[PDB]
Design a protein around this nucleic acid. Structure first.
Lengths: 132, 43, 204, 101, 119
RNA sequence: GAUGUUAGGAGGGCAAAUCCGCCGAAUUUAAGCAUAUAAUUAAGCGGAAGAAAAGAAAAUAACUAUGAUUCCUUUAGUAACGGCGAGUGAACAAGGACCAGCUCAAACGGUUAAUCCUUCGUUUGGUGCAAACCUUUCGACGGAAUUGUCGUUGAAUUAUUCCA
RNA sequence: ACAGGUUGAUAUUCCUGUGCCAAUAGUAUUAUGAGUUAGAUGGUAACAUAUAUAUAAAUGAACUCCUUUACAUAGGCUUUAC
């Protein structure tokens, strides 16, 4: 027998829906190491990292949150769907942990949040939010 | 015995060598001395 | 923020989700061999809050220790002293079980490292399972950092074997100051020795 | 497999191994040994304890014109090795013995 | 009989050749000793001490040559690194020991302890 | 999680007076002895340093209040414990010696982790006969690091004044 | 692995004779005999057969199945050796 709070991490988005959401996020992948150096040399973005994400959710800086399925200690993500619902932001649990890491140039990542995206795509972000 | 192990044989030789009396010219510039019969090596 | 939530979630315990979870963890541990390295801290909140600092040669070890008394060690079940000491069965060790657990990793097994600290993790009737944080001092990351640096000094080998861990501070009574702990403070032996110490001067 | 990123430790010195001169220390000059040289063309040599027969045979050929048919050895009480080196008919012992002593 | 400084200039082949020659002479002295001869028994000591001297010069020359080859590099063989105590080898570098956190550095820079006098 | 004579490193043992953990008696005392006593001793076993341990208030006081730790002088053979027998037995103040403070974690910083490390290198020095040490900034290429490194120590903002 | 001899003191160990056992790499030559125009024959049978400086050589993998190694005590009988 599995407790509800633990149980809710079983039901991800559908695979096709997941891919579509991931693809939509993809272009807002943060500034990468070589690029950062180039920018510096001359003279928006997806925010990650669990502590930072909790603050972003709390302060309603968050607008859409994507949560990884299967971090090894459940506790470090356990509060997050509940918190997101309470502070009233759309959240989605996505199947693949590694890919969310790839999306931020890391070997793994826990959650990723999108505060705002370009005006031309705002409707699509609203659609993902609606699905969630 | 007839047989020995090499370390033991070498040691028996060492004791034998040790016995040899003080050199006669040296006295012209002993107290400690193995004797076989009544004073066993034991090792 | 994140760590606060996880702290409170672990704080409740006998809440359903945690209780299920502890049982599952305890099951896994009951299978695993007695001392083993773990990938990254099992309880991030407690470990980080305690000694742990993530970058490079800080390593986690999970250790299993047997519960209850230890029994008096006298052979064949009889003690030849006075009746006051004749009791074999109910005798109780001075070190806490947590300290023993830090010892079991701390001595030969992980003996490159130095034990920094240790946190609770989980329990069953047969075993208590503790996680021990240990740190290397022969690798640059600890040598360079001005923070935490001290543990590389030669004078901090084997803290867990000397009562110089949080558990160590505990069973020596060093945790509680004030009049209530009285004689403990400069060391229990040292304090006894000072009180006994009988002093004379040249002219009296 | 193996790939050391630099040598672990380097021996600087000339070799501390037991050399050919020093391996064989000196001919034996006992009455018994003189007799053997005379009668059966066999030369008696004192050597280091840690010598082995093959090394003595090579060494003797290098150090003298001797070629060795068979080499018998024994460890004395005193700590010195005694090697009976039986000469081959390729040369005749007496002259070679006379030349060395 | 010969003295170190005269040896030190010489080429390595010549030095080794000289050593081999002395060894042969030494063997000859021993052969004499084993026989009934007494005459030259005193001379062997001289030869042996000379042999020792030749060996010292060659080994030293090699050591220098090896050190000269292994300049810089951060990765000498263990033997050529410092032979200070185990306790010293384990220990921190002074540079590392000295180093301090930035805020502490700021604090020391702003408020150094100072020299002062009174009425 | 295994596996590797993979690359760099570490631990083992000896030494103990002082020093730190354990574990732990009895002879003895009581004119006997059983609780006590001997003793948080001896033996046993583990671990350090040139000293260690302790240390920066979950302290004491009940005053006109003191103010990290250690030690000395002391309180004190006292409060107290104890077949309330034998015996055992503190603390606070006070006089001194010395006199030193601190940082993680927590909060805060995302128009960009500002961190860290190996290997390759590269230069401003200084010593030294040489060996060699000792300072010195600057880049690569790997990794590590958001399952949390780094900065900050509520937050801006004025005048003043300092330090690199 | 045996006999004889030999030294002031050793010998199945030295000497002389005679053997025996174990190794005996790769490559190329040679010589030794086999089989072939990818593996010999005999013997009714039990079984036998290579006498070449040398009885060398009679296809055989995986996988299997044995056997020798390898065994108590007592009592007599019998054969050979000394």
């Amino acid at each position: 027998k599995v407790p509800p709070s633990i149980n809710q991490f079983n039901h991800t988005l559908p695979k096709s829906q997941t891919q579509d959401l991931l693809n939509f996020l993809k272009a807002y992948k943060p500034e990468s190491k070589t690029d950062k150096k180039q920018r510096l040399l001359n003279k928006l973005f997806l925010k990650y990292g669990i502590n930072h994400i909790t603050k972003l959710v709390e302060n309603k800086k968050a607008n859409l949150v994507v949560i990884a399925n299967d971090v090894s200690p459940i506790e470090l993500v356990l509060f997050l769907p509940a918190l997101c619902r309470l502070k009233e932001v759309p959240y989605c649990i996505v199947k693949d942990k590694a890919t969310l890491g790839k999306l931020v140039h890391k070997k793994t990542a826990t959650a990723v949040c999108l505060e705002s995206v370009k005006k031309e795509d705002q409707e699509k972000l609203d659609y993902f939010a609606k699905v969630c | 015995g007839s047989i020995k192990r090499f370390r033991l044989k070498q040691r028996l030789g060492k004791c034998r060598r040790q016995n040899r009396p003080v050199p006669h010219w040296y006295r012209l510039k002993n107290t400690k001395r193995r004797h076989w019969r009544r004073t066993k090596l034991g090792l | 923020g994140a760590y606060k939530y996880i702290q409170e979630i672990w704080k409740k315990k006998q809440s359903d989700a945690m209780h299920f979870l502890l049982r599952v963890r305890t099951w896994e541990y009951r299978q695993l061999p007695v001392v083993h390295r773990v990938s990254k801290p099992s309880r991030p909140d407690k470990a980080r809050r305690l000694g742990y600092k993530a970058i490079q040669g800080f390593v986690i070890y999970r250790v299993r220790v047997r519960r209850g008394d230890r029994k008096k060690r006298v052979k064949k079940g009889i003690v030849h002293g006075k009746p006051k000491h004749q009791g074999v069965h109910k005798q109780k060790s001075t070190r806490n079980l947590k300290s023993v657990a830090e010892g079991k990793v701390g001595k030969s097994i992980c003996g490159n490292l130095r034990v920094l600290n240790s946190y609770w993790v989980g329990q069953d009737a047969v075993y208590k399972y503790y996680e021990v944080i240990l740190v290397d001092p022969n690798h640059n990351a600890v040598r360079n950092n001005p923070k935490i640096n001290w543990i590389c000094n030669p004078v901090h080998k084997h803290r867990e074997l000397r009562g110089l861990t949080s558990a160590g501070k505990k069973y020596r009574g060093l945790r509680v100051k004030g009049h209530l702990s009285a004689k403990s403070r400069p060391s229990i032996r040292a304090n006894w020795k000072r009180r006994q110490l009988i002093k004379l001067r040249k002219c009296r | 497999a193996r790939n050391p990123k630099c040598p672990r430790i380097v021996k600087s010195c000339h070799s501390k191994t037991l050399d050919k001169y020093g391996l064989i220390k000196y001919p034996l000059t006992s009455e018994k040994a003189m007799k053997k040289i005379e009668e059966i063309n066999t030369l008696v040599f004192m050597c280091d304890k840690r010598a082995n027969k093959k090394n003595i045979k090579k060494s003797v050929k290098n150090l003298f014109g001797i070629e060795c048919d068979k080499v018998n050895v024994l460890n004395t009480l005193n700590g010195d090795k005694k090697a009976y080196v039986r000469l081959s008919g390729e040369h005749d012992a007496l002259e070679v013995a006379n030349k060395i002593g | 009989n010969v003295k170190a400084y005269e040896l030190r200039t010489l080429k390595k082949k010549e030095l080794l050749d000289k050593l081999d020659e002395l060894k042969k002479e030494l063997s000859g002295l021993r052969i004499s000793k084993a026989l009934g001869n007494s005459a030259k028994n005193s001379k062997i000591h001289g030869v042996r001490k000379n042999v020792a001297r030749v060996l010292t010069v060659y080994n030293q020359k090699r050591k220098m040559e090896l050190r000269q080859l292994y300049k810089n590099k951060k990765f000498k063989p263990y033997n050529l690194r410092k032979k200070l105590t185990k306790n010293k080898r384990l220990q921190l570098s002074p540079k590392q020991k000295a180093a301090m956190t930035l805020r502490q550095k700021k604090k020391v820079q702003n408020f150094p302890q100072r020299k002062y006098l009174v009425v």
